[PDB]
Amino acid sequence: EFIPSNTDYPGPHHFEVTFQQSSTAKFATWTYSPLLKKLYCQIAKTCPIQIKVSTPPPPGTAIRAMPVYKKAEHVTDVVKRCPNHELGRDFNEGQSAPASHLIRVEGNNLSQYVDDPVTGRQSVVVPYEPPQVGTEFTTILYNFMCNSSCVGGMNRRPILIIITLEMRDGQVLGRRSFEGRICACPGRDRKADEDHYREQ
Amino acid sequence: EFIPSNTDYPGPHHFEVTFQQSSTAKFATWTYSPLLKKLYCQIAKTCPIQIKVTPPPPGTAIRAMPVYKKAEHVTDVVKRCPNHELGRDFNEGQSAPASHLIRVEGNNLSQYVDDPVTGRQSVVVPYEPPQVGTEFTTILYNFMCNSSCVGGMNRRPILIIITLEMRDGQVLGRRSFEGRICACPGRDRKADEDHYRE
DNA sequence: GAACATGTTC
DNA sequence: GAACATGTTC
Ligand SMILES: [Zn+2]
Ligand SMILES: [Zn+2]
């Protein structure tokens, strides 16, 4: 349990996590690499994630975002904000979410922020909301308060976002995961990363 | 007093601040440019600074103190970037306050002073007579934050303000020079000295 | 955004 | 130490 399972498992309900493709326009804040199942996002800059459910789940069902290290070695390490930002004045003050946590859900007040005493694991749970009428997808806002190169945070260590569809009980109804990249230039990094990996 | 004066003023005694030249072998933990009166130093890697003196009324002591080179930022107080101030790697092991950028390695008689009115951080040590056969006294120094350290002096150059002053704390000597805690003190000075030439 | 700065890898 | 990684200046 302390190491959570990256492994995708879309539940009985179709569990789809989709990033509505950013505006094509030049200034991206979060481009997502379909090919790399990787998300390059600017820091503390809201990026939204869509979730598609083929069939409705029993109520109280909810979604848990959780960051973790890709590097097997680090998986053991807990994902947390870099102290330097953890106390940082600039955002702690706007947002009620605990400083430590990396993943902030933006725009929900039922958002529950979690530390697993057993695993000392950061996460943030929100209760599933019916996709807007005439709308396919329940969209969510996620804020990352640490760069991927944030030293004393996950310096230099890639991470995975584990979004799970869970019962109140906690039974896993479906999970999807992808690489994250909080950087300064999610654009450049994506292209270099794409050319860098694809051209290989 | 809030903005300490960069200006050099060797006094009655000849205040000699000098870095005995580094090995000249390829590896450079630290280097000091005499052209730019700038010192390049790897982080937290001990760097030795000596001083050559007229003997000075006892209790005289010497204080290092960092200040931003950029006028705009002289007002700001140089301090360890949180993410280091917290940092386990060295904050444990040494007895000096994490806040502090400059650490003196050799002494236990060193005092790390956080001014209440200015709020500035510096370390004061008492002058020791150069050891016999030694022309001058030599003080270890430790910088616990890269010159490019976020939440500290993340991008902004600094000057080390060294001064020898009496127990009264009056100013007897003073010299300052720019510092740059980097990861590659060598390439930097060559880049910077190279740059300046052209 | 391209030029630059600056830490890290192999 | 060269070549890569990555926030930052203008
Ligand atoms: Zn951070
Ligand atoms: Zn630091």
Numbering used by the authors:
A (entry chain A): 113 to 312
B (entry chain B): 113 to 165, 167 to 311
How do the authors describe this structure?
The p53 family of transcription factors is composed of the proteins p53, p63 and p73 (1–3) that share an N-terminal transactivation domain (TA), a central sequence-specific DNA-binding domain (DBD) and an oligomerization domain (OD) within the C-terminal domain. The p53-family response element (RE) has a loose consensus which, based largely on in vitro binding studies, consists of two decameric ½-sites separated by a short spacer (n): RRRCWWGYYY-(n)-RRRCWWGYYY (R = purine; W = A/T; Y = pyrimidine; n = 0–13, although for the majority of validated REs have n < 3). Similar to p53, human p73 DBD was shown to self-assemble as a tetramer (dimer of dimers) on a full-site RE. The crystal structures of all the members of the p53 family show that the DNA-recognition residues are conserved across the family.
The crystal structure of the p73 S139F DBD in complex with the GAACA full-site RE also shows that loop L1, where K138 and the mutation S139F are located, is important for RE recognition. The configuration of the protein–DNA tetramer complex is consistent with the C2 molecular symmetry found in the structures of the WT DBDs of the three members of the p53 family. As mentioned, the overall structure of the WT and S139F mutant is alike with a root mean square deviation (r.m.s. dev.) between the α carbons of the WT p73 DBD and the S139F mutant of only 1.15. Loop L1 carries the mutation S139F that is in close proximity to the first purine nucleotide of the ½-site RE. However, loop L1 in the S139F mutant is moved further away from the base pairs in comparison with loop L1 in WT p73 DBD. In both monomers A (D) and B (C), the Phe139 residue in the p73 DBD S139F mutant is rotated away from the DNA molecule owing to the hydrophobic repulsion between the charged phosphate in the DNA backbone and the aromatic phenylalanine ring. The S139F mutation changes the conformation of loop L1 by removing the hydrogen-bonds from K138 and S139 that contact DNA in the WT protein. As a result of loop S7-S8 movement towards the adjacent monomer, the total buried tetramerization interface increases from 979 Å2 in the WT tetramer to 1188 Å2 for the mutant S139F tetramer. Our main structural observation is that the mutation S139F increases the flexibility of loop L1, together with more subtle structural rearrangements in the N-terminus and the loops S3-S4 and S7-S8. The observation that p73 S139F DBD has a much higher Kd than the WT p73 for the GAACA ½-site RE correlates with the destabilization of loop L1 in the crystal structure of the mutant with the GAACA RE.
